[PDB]
Enzyme design. Structure first.
Site, mmCIF file in Angstrom:
data_model
loop_
_atom_site.group_PDB
_atom_site.id
_atom_site.type_symbol
_atom_site.label_atom_id
_atom_site.label_comp_id
_atom_site.label_asym_id
_atom_site.label_seq_id
_atom_site.Cartn_x
_atom_site.Cartn_y
_atom_site.Cartn_z
ATOM 1 N N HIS A 345 101.848 114.992 3.829
ATOM 2 C CA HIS A 345 100.647 115.125 3.017
ATOM 3 C C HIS A 345 100.725 116.184 1.928
ATOM 4 O O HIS A 345 99.762 116.395 1.229
ATOM 5 C CB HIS A 345 99.472 115.450 3.911
ATOM 6 C CG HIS A 345 99.215 114.430 4.972
ATOM 7 N ND1 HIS A 345 98.466 113.294 4.746
ATOM 8 C CD2 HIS A 345 99.569 114.397 6.277
ATOM 9 C CE1 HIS A 345 98.365 112.613 5.871
ATOM 10 N NE2 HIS A 345 99.023 113.260 6.815
ATOM 11 N N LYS A 536 85.415 119.245 -3.189
ATOM 12 C CA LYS A 536 86.628 119.200 -2.382
ATOM 13 C C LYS A 536 86.915 120.660 -1.999
ATOM 14 O O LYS A 536 86.272 121.571 -2.518
ATOM 15 C CB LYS A 536 87.792 118.628 -3.222
ATOM 16 C CG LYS A 536 88.040 119.404 -4.527
ATOM 17 C CD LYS A 536 89.100 118.761 -5.417
ATOM 18 C CE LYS A 536 88.622 117.430 -5.943
ATOM 19 N NZ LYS A 536 89.758 116.608 -6.434
ATOM 20 N N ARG A 537 87.859 120.889 -1.086
ATOM 21 C CA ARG A 537 88.179 122.261 -0.691
ATOM 22 C C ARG A 537 88.573 123.085 -1.927
ATOM 23 O O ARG A 537 89.061 122.537 -2.933
ATOM 24 C CB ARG A 537 89.306 122.283 0.370
ATOM 25 C CG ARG A 537 88.896 121.680 1.723
ATOM 26 C CD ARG A 537 87.767 122.480 2.395
ATOM 27 N NE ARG A 537 88.189 123.836 2.717
ATOM 28 C CZ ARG A 537 88.751 124.196 3.865
ATOM 29 N NH1 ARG A 537 88.953 123.302 4.822
ATOM 30 N NH2 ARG A 537 89.137 125.453 4.051
ATOM 31 N N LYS A 542 93.752 122.728 -7.011
ATOM 32 C CA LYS A 542 92.748 121.707 -7.322
ATOM 33 C C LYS A 542 92.056 122.108 -8.622
ATOM 34 O O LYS A 542 91.425 121.286 -9.310
ATOM 35 C CB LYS A 542 91.753 121.573 -6.174
ATOM 36 C CG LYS A 542 92.335 120.815 -4.987
ATOM 37 C CD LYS A 542 91.448 120.896 -3.745
ATOM 38 C CE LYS A 542 92.010 120.063 -2.592
ATOM 39 N NZ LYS A 542 92.015 118.601 -2.901
ATOM 40 N N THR A 644 91.472 111.519 -1.884
ATOM 41 C CA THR A 644 90.722 110.359 -1.432
ATOM 42 C C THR A 644 89.328 110.434 -2.043
ATOM 43 O O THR A 644 88.644 109.418 -2.203
ATOM 44 C CB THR A 644 90.627 110.294 0.131
ATOM 45 O OG1 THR A 644 90.038 111.496 0.636
ATOM 46 C CG2 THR A 644 92.019 110.131 0.744
HETATM 47 C C1 LIG Z 1 86.746 112.772 0.795
HETATM 48 C C2 LIG Z 1 86.620 114.217 1.258
HETATM 49 C C3 LIG Z 1 87.701 115.180 1.143
HETATM 50 C C4 LIG Z 1 89.036 114.822 0.472
HETATM 51 O O1 LIG Z 1 88.888 114.719 -0.949
HETATM 52 P P1 LIG Z 1 89.778 115.600 -1.960
HETATM 53 O O2 LIG Z 1 89.149 115.628 -3.334
HETATM 54 O O3 LIG Z 1 91.179 115.045 -2.096
HETATM 55 O O4 LIG Z 1 89.916 117.033 -1.467
HETATM 56 C C5 LIG Z 1 87.478 116.501 1.622
HETATM 57 N N1 LIG Z 1 86.324 116.850 2.209
HETATM 58 C C6 LIG Z 1 85.292 115.991 2.362
HETATM 59 C C7 LIG Z 1 84.046 116.509 3.037
HETATM 60 C C8 LIG Z 1 85.387 114.634 1.930
HETATM 61 O O5 LIG Z 1 84.325 113.755 2.086
HETATM 62 O O1 LIG Z 2 96.853 112.438 2.955
HETATM 63 C C1 LIG Z 2 95.474 112.760 2.880
HETATM 64 C C2 LIG Z 2 95.243 114.001 2.043
HETATM 65 O O2 LIG Z 2 95.773 115.132 2.772
HETATM 66 C C3 LIG Z 2 95.471 116.355 2.102
HETATM 67 O O3 LIG Z 2 94.083 116.451 1.827
HETATM 68 C C4 LIG Z 2 96.252 116.393 0.791
HETATM 69 O O4 LIG Z 2 96.077 117.650 0.159
HETATM 70 C C5 LIG Z 2 95.736 115.245 -0.098
HETATM 71 O O5 LIG Z 2 96.482 115.196 -1.309
HETATM 72 C C6 LIG Z 2 95.896 113.918 0.660
HETATM 73 O O6 LIG Z 2 95.302 112.869 -0.081
#
Ligand SMILES: *Cc1c(COP(=O)(O)O)cnc(C)c1O
Ligand SMILES: OC[C@H]1O[C@H](O)[C@H](O)[C@@H](O)[C@@H]1O
Ligand SMILES: O=C(Nc1ccc([C@@H](O)CO)cc1)c1cc2cc(Cl)ccc2[nH]1
Ligand SMILES: O=C(Nc1ccc([C@@H](O)CO)cc1)c1cc2cc(Cl)ccc2[nH]1
Ligand SMILES: *Cc1c(COP(=O)(O)O)cnc(C)c1O
Ligand SMILES: OC[C@H]1O[C@H](O)[C@H](O)[C@@H](O)[C@@H]1O
Lengths: 798, 791
Positions: A345, A536-537, A542, A644
């Site tokens: 990942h 996102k985190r 990021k 995601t």
């Molecule tokens: C979908 C989701 C993530 C992952 O999204 P990223 O933009 O790739 O970090 C992280 N946290 C929560 C609460 C989510 O719903």
């Molecule tokens: O594999 C699922 C996810 O794992 C972590 O959140 C990674 O930082 C992200 O890039 C990836 O999409």
């Protein structure tokens, strides 16, 4: 028809289960009573599904993960059982607010983000495709911390999601198992024995995972640690039982970061021991030469390793096979590789697990010996193939001989797995050809790609009933179990009535979510503004910072020319920072300092509002996402393995501004690059800049609008009481920024301008949204699981 | 009728609640499913009962206690709801063993013994008499430890009774409350403020207490501590500290251990409880009626902090004048004393209380100063009177005599037996009784005939009902009717048969657990209770050895066989008690493996003695050992349990033993040894143990044997400590009662050879058990202390 029965059932539970009546019953009682009512519809199919797996014995999938970012279960359960509208009717007739009740449920935030959320989406998809899949994790008494903002800074509070109990879990006492720690190794003529160890009990708690409208309900088994019973000073000894139970107390809140803490290692082994044991148990209790059993193990079991977190599972399987089952190393090693598969990942070095040999030696001594074994045999092979490239040996070894001898868990995963995968084309390509080129050279076929996905149940039907209804009312329901069918939405690119309806849905989401932002935050929201959000985190990679440099840039422009036509925006930024991450917290403080300066400036008024969305989490992502117009996915090229969240916004009607990183690329591929606001450097461009050497001050000097932003932050414009409060950010930004913030600034702001331009043209904006939504299909987790099942697990959907 | 509905209900639960079917269902699943099925019949009346208290607003009773020795709830619930025979039929038809299912339930052993068991018996009685009573305690995650015997010694194991969950409890989240600790006091012009404190949350868990066949179900509210919502990891882990307040029950019976965590528990339950009580009162000028709506009974001095806690709320939070508050406080509280042993009296060091509960130390000083000011104004010259009545023992380490705090903040103080209350009144607290004679009362203890007759001895109960009716259940006094059969030989054979079936059913328990082979025709001589030098299991031990020696000496003399059963737990930190357990198991090993003794004498240390186990052994005993030194047992309740179940009693004129002799007739009990005065006259003259050692042959051999290594060859001087205590530090006159004891025991064996007369004495005993019913005890509490009416 079930409306009247659901009502009677609800009353049955409020009374018998909550011991209450409509007069002394709390909102929580109603939530619990409804959950129990809905939960009852799961038992039949849950018992059945599992019974079916025993009789038909299809190959099983075990998603072994340290995280399961599940969110709330109620609504999700109602939808996958075709029970939501009936329950909504039930609760309505009883005089209750169904929405008010769902908000009582605590999120099962047993994850950090992305990784843990992929597990949750996968569970929902595997149940929907009818696979015999099980998820194995740790039942943390405390999941990712609740985040508060005090005096502008992030403050962490314990997330005791189990305080009032979790109705969605069922302890399986008869399946408790012992897990061993420490002790020492004693080789004898009876085989190898691991003795004088400390025992800790694993008590599994099962949670049902309903497939979407298909009669199957799978299982998510989460383990919890417990002190064993056998064998002044008495009180302390009883109290000391907390130590053993501390193994599953908290989830480590680090996203893409390795913290070599002993307790964490204990958790990883913890879940690995219990899981493997339970798996060996189920295998032996099934329908599937003295040793005529385990030969079929790889054809009945498939264990997917979510990141390197459960890497110990490989030597653990070797320990059981060799020490307990007495198989020759050869056969065991063979079955091990045929059983395990690894999913990578990240490529960030700080996110790679390298446990110190010293730590592993006193905690898991027998396993260190097994890893050495695997390694020696591994290096012996390399030598026999390249007897002169000595450099090749240390580059492929599972032990980093350097200073503090560590174990490269990643390398352990590659040799003990028949398949290794990335989560996005660009990422898997880098994993295959760059990070682990020495391994891919030897085993080219081993490395694969499986672009990530999200479940359209939770991320469409659940969070956006309006949009889903709109879609089904034009192309059918089929798109749910075959998101690919969303391309049919291309027939309406010209239909103006469909575009007004698309916009209306987005509008109702924005108004419903604005009210959320007004009952929580001070500011007043401009309902006609564009909703620009990044959730996102919090990481420097990021780059919420880059976005922050943009808001300030917009602010300055408005004050400079307070009469120029400015496309209003409600910039929403949110995400948690890992407690020990200093820059991330400084960044959160920055963002909230600017907001305070932008929202209270009368000269700006309804033109620009900034909001730091607090305690960003799954159930909250379900509210803000369906309500956004522009999605920020601006990580430095090559940092996001996939992402995601970018997929979530796309399926929900938001346009994307971002770099050619992670899954963003594949999104551009599907919808058409022109249909996304791509900008900034790409892979090679970042490479060419690292070759030449990054010098941030030159962009600071060559970019006017940038200099003001930076000067303002550094001089105290956003922190008068503390003029040099952000000195740390400036210093990192000027002499230690490995994510090229300033290098993408100009291309970013220029891109953002284009965005505002298009926003003034609703006809064209919504036309691009349709093209995006219509191209979302690929990014469904069902598609992802199909490829996993077919190219790695060798199992058939349904 | 409900057999078919109970069966459907059972299946409904196995499926929906346990997610199982008859093929993959464990014995535990069946237990849980049955518990849930039975538990459902409680909700209606539980909601109703409580609702009725809100509307009719009768004065409420709050039994505040650190212990609640509850035992198992299933069967107890079935019986009080008239559902046992129907459920038994339900489980039978489904092909299950009802008995096998009941054994799955973990005892709620949140008690040590006696004290905690009186609370449990009281709850059952108050619910039966229809009173608006509530029990407040601590939901220990771990109750009294499970006891194992390894290499002859007691070994402690954690009692995690909550591992698989407890279906008999319901968390009441909406009623969580904060409890404060440490901090400092800051007096201001707005009143007094207690600030900078650490907060710990109290989460109440309610458990229903079904009254026996009367539609009412009361509530037992038990509190659990919770923390309020890698320096981060450690901080999350450190939440264990706050939650450690309700982690374990302190395993000390009649012993004070001044540990800080224990003090935190006492205040813990006191703060939460009082707050909840003030809350209920307000939800029904206000506080003027508080004493007429609330009655808080203090079980021992454990919740003594409740008094200054009520003063703190009234004065600091409700802003009442000290006078009024103090007035309402005394009208609200009542204290029950359970011991006269100095080592069992709570005296907390001022230093400890000052840093933990600083505001409360100030309140106790206040109470005291005003208390001493009164004493002076009445006796301005007796300076000695002042320190003897103060709540602060100025001596060396300044401590707080919690007992004295309880006497002034309570309008009533009581003992648990005539002789005991007399000593508490006229001796221990003479200075207080002189000033407030009316204050001190007596309330002889009792036991519930539901759990201790109908439940544990269906055979005996059935026998009784089949001759005098059911009435005896809600009026044990009606047992006197059993006198009409003193001549009926058929009734005596039936009485003996019941006892026999109990012994055979219990012998099998002893054979599947212990090595030895039981003589079914032997006399069952048992002593079960916590291990103390004062309860003197030792004296009994000196008797078994005396019997042993006699058999070897004259291996043909007519010896009345006996199965001596001794049992009870020892407090982990009690050395002599543990030595005593080791002794008892060394002898047993020597008596059971001696072929020359064979079926004549067997000794068994009954392991992990507890409530559900007391229910097995008691109905199966012939002779009950109640041999404490005269004046040490405030009352005892086990002695009452055996009496109602058909055992004869050998014991001193101590505690409730006296009142038992009163009811059945002294001649109908094997009373022996010194009495109050005799112990006094011996402490005056001074105790010299070696003289009995020299003047008593059979004694010298026993003592020589123990000290020389006869019962511990591998460790010849293993019991040196016991010998030394027995010879130069025995404050319980073991040797002084030895001769009278063995002589008494001989009489017992004599009578045992005459079943006609033995069973005649048993009837007289059972027929006189009536007084010792907890229903009678609660009536006296309700009428002379709580001012509440039984229904
Ligand atoms: C979908 C989701 C993530 C992952 O999204 P990223 O933009 O790739 O970090 C992280 N946290 C929560 C609460 C989510 O719903
Ligand atoms: O594999 C699922 C996810 O794992 C972590 O959140 C990674 O930082 C992200 O890039 C990836 O999409
Ligand atoms: O916890 C459950 N039951 C329970 C049973 C007994 C007790 C207690 O009596 C202690 O065992 C507590 C909870 C439970 C049932 C269930 C069904 C589904 Cl589909 C999903 C999750 C579930 N959890
Ligand atoms: O635990 C109970 N209910 C419950 C409620 C909710 C949940 C979950 O929804 C988690 O809160 C689990 C159990 C319970 C009901 C009950 C009834 C009687 Cl009469 C006596 C004791 C009782 N306990
Ligand atoms: C009745 C009982 C006691 C009381 O024993 P005493 O010697 O009378 O103090 C102790 N423990 C249990 C389990 C009981 O049932
Ligand atoms: O009051 C209940 C019990 O409390 C204590 O355990 C006393 O030692 C005992 O004599 C009494 O019976």
């Amino acid at each position: 028809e079930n409306v009247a029965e659901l009502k009677k059932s609800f009353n049955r539970h409020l009374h018998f289960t909550l011991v209450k009546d409509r007069n002394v019953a709390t909102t929580r009682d109603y939530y619990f009573a409804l959950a129990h009512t809905v939960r009852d519809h799961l038992v039949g199919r849950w018992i059945r599904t599992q019974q079916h797996y025993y009789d038909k014995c299809p190959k099983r999938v075990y998603y072994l993960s340290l995280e399961f970012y599940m969110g709330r279960t109620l609504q999700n359960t109602m939808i996958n059982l075709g029970l939501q509208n009936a329950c909504d009717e039930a609760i309505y007739q009883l005089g209750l607010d169904i929405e008010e009740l769902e908000e009582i449920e605590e999120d099962a935030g047993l994850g950090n983000g992305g990784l843990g959320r992929l597990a949750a989406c996968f569970l929902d998809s595997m149940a929907t495709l009818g696979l015999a899949a099980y998820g194995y994790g740790i039942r943390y008494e405390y999941g990712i911390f609740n985040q508060k903002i005090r005096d502008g800074w992030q403050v962490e509070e314990a997330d005791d999601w189990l305080r009032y109990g979790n109705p969605w879990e069922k302890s399986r006492p008869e399946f408790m198992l012992p897990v061993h720690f420490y002790g020492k190794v004693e080789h004898t003529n009876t085989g190898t024995k691991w003795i004088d160890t400390q025992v800790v009990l694993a008590l599994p708690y099962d949670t049902p995972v309903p497939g979407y409208m298909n009669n199957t309900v799978n299982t998510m088994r989460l383990w919890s640690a417990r002190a064993p019973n056998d064998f002044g000073d008495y009180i302390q000894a009883v109290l000391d039982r907390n130590l053993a139970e501390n193994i599953s107390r908290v989830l480590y809140p680090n996203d893409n970061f390795f913290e070599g803490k002993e307790l964490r290692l204990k958790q990883e082994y913890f879940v690995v021991a219990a899981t493997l044991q339970d798996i060996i148990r189920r295998f032996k209790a099934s329908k599937f030469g003295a040793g005529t059993v385990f030969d079929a193990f790889p054809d009945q079991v498939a264990i997917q390793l979510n990141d390197t977190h459960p890497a110990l599972a490989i030597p653990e399987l070797m320990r059981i096979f060799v020490d307990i089952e007495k198989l020759p190393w050869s056969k065991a090693w063979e079955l091990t590789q045929k059983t395990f598969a690894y999913t990578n990942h990240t490529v960030l070095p700080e996110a790679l697990e390298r446990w110190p040999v010293d730590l592993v030696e006193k905690l898991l001594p027998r396993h260190l010996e097994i890893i050495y074994e695997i390694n020696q045999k591994h290096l012996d092979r390399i030598v026999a193939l390249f007897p002169k490239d000595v450099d090749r040996l240390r580059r492929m070894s599972l032990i980093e001989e350097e200073g503090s001898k560590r174990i490269n868990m990643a390398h352990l995963c590659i040799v003990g797995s028949h398949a290794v995968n990335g989560v996005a084309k660009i990422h898997s390509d880098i994993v295959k050809t760059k990070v682990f080129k020495d391994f891919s050279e030897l085993e080219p076929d081993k490395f694969q790609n499986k672009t990530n996905g999200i479940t359209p149940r939770r991320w469409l039907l659940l969070c956006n009933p309006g949009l889903a209804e709109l879609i089904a009312e034009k192309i059918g329901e089929d798109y749910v179990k075959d998101l690919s069918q969303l391309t049919k939405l291309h027939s309406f690119l010209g239909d103006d009535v469909f575009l007004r309806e698309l916009a209306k849905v987005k509008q109702e989401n924005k108004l419903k979510f604005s009210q959320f932002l007004e009952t929580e935050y001070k500011v007043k929201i401009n309902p006609s503004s564009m909703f620009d959000v990044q959730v996102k985190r919090i990481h420097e990679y990021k780059r919420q910072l880059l976005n922050c440099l943009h808001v300030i840039t917009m602010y300055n422009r408005i004050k400079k020319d307070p009469k120029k036509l400015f496309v209003p925006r409600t910039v929403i930024i949110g995400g948690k920072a890992a407690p020990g991450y200093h820059m991330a917290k400084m960044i959160i403080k920055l963002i909230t300092s600017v907001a305070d300066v932008v929202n209270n400036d009368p000269m700006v008024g309804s033109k620009l509002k900034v909001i730091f969305l607090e305690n960003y989490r799954v159930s909250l992502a379900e509210k803000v996402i369906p309500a956004t117009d522009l999605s920020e996915q601006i990580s430095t090229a090559g940092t996001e393995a996939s992402g995601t969240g970018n997929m979530k916004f796309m399926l929900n009607g938001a346009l994307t501004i971002g770099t050619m990183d992670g899954a963003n690329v594949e999104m551009a591929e599907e919808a058409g690059e022109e249909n996304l606001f791509i900008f900034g450097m790409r892979i090679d461009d970042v490479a060419a800049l690292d070759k030449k050497g990054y010098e941030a001050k030159e962009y600071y000097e060559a970019l006017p609008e940038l200099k003001l932003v930076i000067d303002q932050i550094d001089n105290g414009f956003f922190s008068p009481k503390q003029p040099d409060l952000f000195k740390d950010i400036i210093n990192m930004l000027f002499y230690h920024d490995r994510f090229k913030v300033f290098a993408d600034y100009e291309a970013y702001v220029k891109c953002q301008d284009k965005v505002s331009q298009l926003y003034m043209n609703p006809k064209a904006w919504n036309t691009m949204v349709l093209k995006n939504i219509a191209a979302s299909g690929k990014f469904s987790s069902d598609r992802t699981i199909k490829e996993y099942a077919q190219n790695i697990w060798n199992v058939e959907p349904s």
